């Protein structure tokens, strides 16, 4: 208990200070990015993983995890907003292909991908459009993220077929044409949206759900059990030096 709980509380306090500073002045982004790198290195260190796993508290552990995953999700968003505003303020124009996340279920230019939680700095959305030539829809509930994302796409990828909207999945007119769906990891509602998508989507749709379980759940929303007759987990992609893992879902 004692050891890992103390560090996790200290990270929560550090994230509070860094996040509050960045809200007042975006010059403190570099310090927050460094904290996020240190946090990542902590999460992926087998020593801390073992300590975390050994802490068999139920209530306090669960709550502390939930406090961290919420504030660090806000930090991820704030980094994206600042990076986006910097690119647009200028008015000027890596290690893994997103296609890799779908294993055998490959993406061609004839396919159509929905990315849930596109974000203000939608590099992943642009990446997959450029790599695959597929049509791409990104949704984000935050209109700041919709505006920044839309205008970044128009600068960096004007020739790709990319739509960004605040529409919920039940409001997407072309939902039945979607062949591939990716969920960003830092979406609290991702499993409720997954369940809603069952009835909305065609029968052969494939979903890549990004998540973090165990110690990775302090920087990600975790996996959940799905309704067993609806979404079947056909593949789990878990790696020790990846800050998020991927669960592939198909119908029945
Ligand atoms: C950090 S950002 C961008 C994606 C991020 N890079 C990731 O991979 O987790 C996460 C985005 O998801 C958005 N978001 C959160 N909940 C959502 C929901 N229920 N539906 C759509 N977008 C959501 C946030 O507004 C935010 O812009």
- The DSSP element (H or E) to which 164 belongs, if any, is strand 162-165
Instruction: Let me know: does 209 contact 238? Beta carbons within 8 Å.
Output: no
Instruction: Let me know: does 132 contact 156? Beta carbons within 8 Å.
Output: no
Residue 234 in tokens? 């056909």
Resolution reached, in Å? 1.8
Centre of ligand 1 to C-alpha 140, Å, is 6
Cα distance between residue 199 and residue 176, in whole Å: 10
Tell me if residue 199 falls in helix, strand or coil: helix
Cα distance between residue 232 and residue 182, in whole Å: 16
Instruction: Count CB neighbours of 176 within 10 A.
Output: 11
206-211/245-251 β-pairing: antiparallel
The residues with which 250 forms a beta bridge, in sequence order, are 232
Which residues have CB under 6 Å of ligand 1?
76-77, 80, 116-117, 119-120, 139-142, 145, 184-187, 189
* Method used to obtain the model: X-ray
Burial status of residue 241 (CB atoms within 10 A of its CB: 0-12, 13-18, 19 or more): exposed
Cα distance between residue 136 and residue 153, in whole Å: 11
In eight-state DSSP terms, residue 58 is S
Residue 98 in tokens? 């997103």
Instruction: Let me know: does 200 contact 216? Beta carbons within 8 Å.
Output: no
Which residue, among 159, 44, 161, has the nearest Cα to 111 in the 3D structure?
161
């Amino acid at each position: 208990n004692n050891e890992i709980k103390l560090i996790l509380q200290q990270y929560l306090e550090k994230f509070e200070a860094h996040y509050e500073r960045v809200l007042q002045d975006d010059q403190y982004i570099e310090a927050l990015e460094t904290l996020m790198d240190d946090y990542s290195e902590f999460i992926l260190n087998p020593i801390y993983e073992q300590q975390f796993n050994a802490w068999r508290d139920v209530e306090e552990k669960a709550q502390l995890i939930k406090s961290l995953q919420y504030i660090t999700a806000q930090c991820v968003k704030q980094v994206e907003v600042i990076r986006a505003r910097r690119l647009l303020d200028g008015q000027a124009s890596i290690e893994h292909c997103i296609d890799e996340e779908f294993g055998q279920c490959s993406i061609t230019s004839n396919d159509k991908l929905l990315l849930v939680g596109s974000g203000a700095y939608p590099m992943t959305l642009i990446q997959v459009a450029k790599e695959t030539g597929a049509s791409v829809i990104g949704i984000d509930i935050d209109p700041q993220a919709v505006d920044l994302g839309r205008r970044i796409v128009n600068v960096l990828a004007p020739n790709e077929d990319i739509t960004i909207t605040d529409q919920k999945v039940s409001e997407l007119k072309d939902i039945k044409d979607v062949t591939h769906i990716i969920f960003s990891s830092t979406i609290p509602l991702k499993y409720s949206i997954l369940e809603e998508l069952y009835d909305l989507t065609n029968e052969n749709v494939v979903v890549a759900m990004r998540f973090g379980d165990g110690i990775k759940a302090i920087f990600n929303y975790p996996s959940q059990e799905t309704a067993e007759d609806k979404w079947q987990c056909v593949n789990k992609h878990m790696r020790p030096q990846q800050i998020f893992d991927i669960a592939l879902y198909k119908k029945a």
